[PDB]
């Protein structure tokens, strides 16, 4: 049974890395990408922390697991993923894997340990369950100070970007690396197969890095994209509301937005260092050659595209797209340009590890694509499905279907749907939902979405068929 | 022999405005009904939101049982209609031979009264298709952006808050609803079947829109603002700060704007007092009044700047939670009831009057014993009311409140901050005492009372409550 290592990162965009022709030199990630299978059109399930992680680790959509919002935050109803959901963690433990977990969990206090893992170190490790939702009174005060024209140390805005004191060695990231090194050292001492997860809070906003990462990218040299610095025209109302207090970006200057990029880029450089330290330890311990590796970001993050920061209830590519590398040491490297989903991770682990089934797989194993390339799916529709059921206690019910040339977003809590022509408008600036020139494409996408909601037994199909009755 | 029933239902009508409650508006027709009937002077709504309160009124069950726990048809609620599995008192009355008629605001799903057997004579929902998209307030958003830039609408008004309508009373939706109600009463007098009429007015809801003379009847310059007007909210839950509906941004409101919101609302109350008189005079002219069993109720109150809030939202303040309620049984002597009653008590009261068949649980109680005996019917019983605020237009909050005459405890499970108000010493609910160790005995009492109530109604939030309140259980 093969050794598996997952390197999971929070709110890491698909596009930043040098292997994607992005602005940050990421030699260690690029080397893993070129040794493994690049999923260059990977899509998350939801641009939100807990839902994306539950889908990743269970292999089922939120309507089946119940984990359809963030946990532990104003004003979500949810505290934890049900312990009835053992996830790949309990399934691997059941067949004799030593499972270990380091870092960000965000699926309920103690959750990895309750499912049989060694939860070595992380925020959720010694927390009591059923805590009250964290309510951002301080961030509300801070953003009011920003709107009043105040700034933090050195003119920074610490709800967006911050220079941390000290060095890399003092960071949470370095501690997560060091716990991952200990995990690898301990695994090399056992004959038992191991399944390790190292889950980093970096590079999530607010973008907080020590020197030299804080200053390595000059804000003045940042290239800003075509959808930066735009007013949202004819977009759904949920994109305008201040769900979390830092979504008020009315105080942000162009310099503030540029520093949000430059500090994020420093965080990506720091993550590449962290990946190299773990890969070099895996090599030194003699585990690397047979190590089956997943590197993934749970979703992306908005850096001022459509005038949005962080995440919220919407489907733009900067949030919906995720970086994904799956390295199987038995296979030659390939680049997969067909779309894949976060729902495909658990079936891939299940095939690698011969995990027992614990119910439905709403995705598919990526091994055929890893072995054969895009030709594995020749003749099949190239779609992805995205949901945004909730944002921190706000219900939206959002569903998107994305093809290589178009995206349709159903907003059942609104009157306004979205239709983007990704071939002619890849920056998703122009909502074409009301344009009669796109009636054929809209009709196709509505039918594709109905098929997908039926496939996954989404109970919102009934409302979909009412809203879409003109098709 | 089955009694004729008339319900006069008003949207967002506060408990306190009427002259019979020593309020600032002369309301002689409502006062006369209060003086002839049973005054429920401490009536409480179930939820300060339109569709949940109306579903609880017409079904007699809480929203976790009926499913109707949010507004329907509004950004960004998941709901479109009260399930047709819920016949309500409308289908139950039709099934025993009442001719049921409905006029005006429904807000429980397109065609709903008609689908349940009523003559839906006239109203917004009568000819609407079902399963419509949620109304999303793009224009209100644009309007409030202009207000925040310092703009005003015509004649200095702010039409998301108050507006002088063109024309006369006779041109209004209210007058049309009265004319349909008069036709309903005229037709009822020609039938040998008992009748059940509901006339449900959008007035006096905000934005406060009235024609002359009601628009200028009450001088804004004379308005008395209360002690909790315009204050900075100290140590209150975060949901009271967020701009759920676009007009909740009141940062642009001057004191004069708030006084005009009051004076226009007072005009709307005067206008509905006229409407009530017109319908009561028609019932008298048609020979129906002497035996007519009448309920006058507001679905909830409305905020006029108390705690710096406008309209409604996810919170439990008395100006929203309290509702006006008069129940006139012509066989009984008039009394004033000072013990708390609930919107959940309306359906059981109708059930006793009308001998309605059981269609499931009654989460409230019939008010006939109080109507007959006065407050002493319940001597020895805890005087409590239970309030819920599960959702506000697609925002989940799970709020529960328990109110006694002297205290209120509010559980906000989507927050870390609960509320505790000493209504005896702080009736304006300015000071949140949740963290004050001097109120530990009262907090413990109210947490126990809430635990009893959630258990009684089989609320599935008891699992979470038991965790949040574990220090008290
Ligand atoms: Ca995330
Ligand atoms: Ca109402
Ligand atoms: Cl860090
Ligand atoms: Cl845009
Ligand atoms: Cl295969
Ligand atoms: Cl009117
Ligand atoms: Cl206050
Ligand atoms: Cl009785």
Author numbering:
A (entry chain A): 36 to 506
B (entry chain B): 35 to 507
What text appears in the publication on this structure?
Despite extensive efforts, we were unable to circumvent generation of this inappropriately matured form of the protein. Though we were unable to produce active recombinant S1_NC, given this knowledge of its probable substrate, we tested PS47 cell extracts for carrageenan sulfatase activity. We observed conversion of ι-NC2 to a product having a TLC mobility consistent with β-neocarrabiose (β-NC2), most likely indicating desulfation of both monosaccharide residues by the sequential activities of S1_NC and S1_19B. Taken together, these results support assignment of S1_NC as an exo-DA2S carrageenan sulfatase that would likely have activity on any form of carrageenan having a non-reducing end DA2S residue (e.g., ι- or α-carrageenan).
The polysaccharides in red algae (Rhodophyta) are primarily mixed galactan agars such as agarose and carrageenan. Carrageenans are high molecular weight polymers having a linear backbone of repeating D-galactopyranose units (G) linked together by alternating α-1,3 and β-1,4 linkages. Furthermore, transcriptomics revealed upregulation of the CarPUL during growth on ι-carrageenan, while biochemical analysis of eight CarPUL-encoded enzymes revealed carrageenan-specific activity, thus associating the CarPUL with the ability of these pseudoalteromonads to liberate energy from carrageenan. Detailed analysis of the enzyme activities encoded by the CarPUL, combined with interpretation of growth phenotypes, have allowed us to propose a refined and detailed model of κ- and ι-carrageenan processing by some Pseudoalteromonas species.
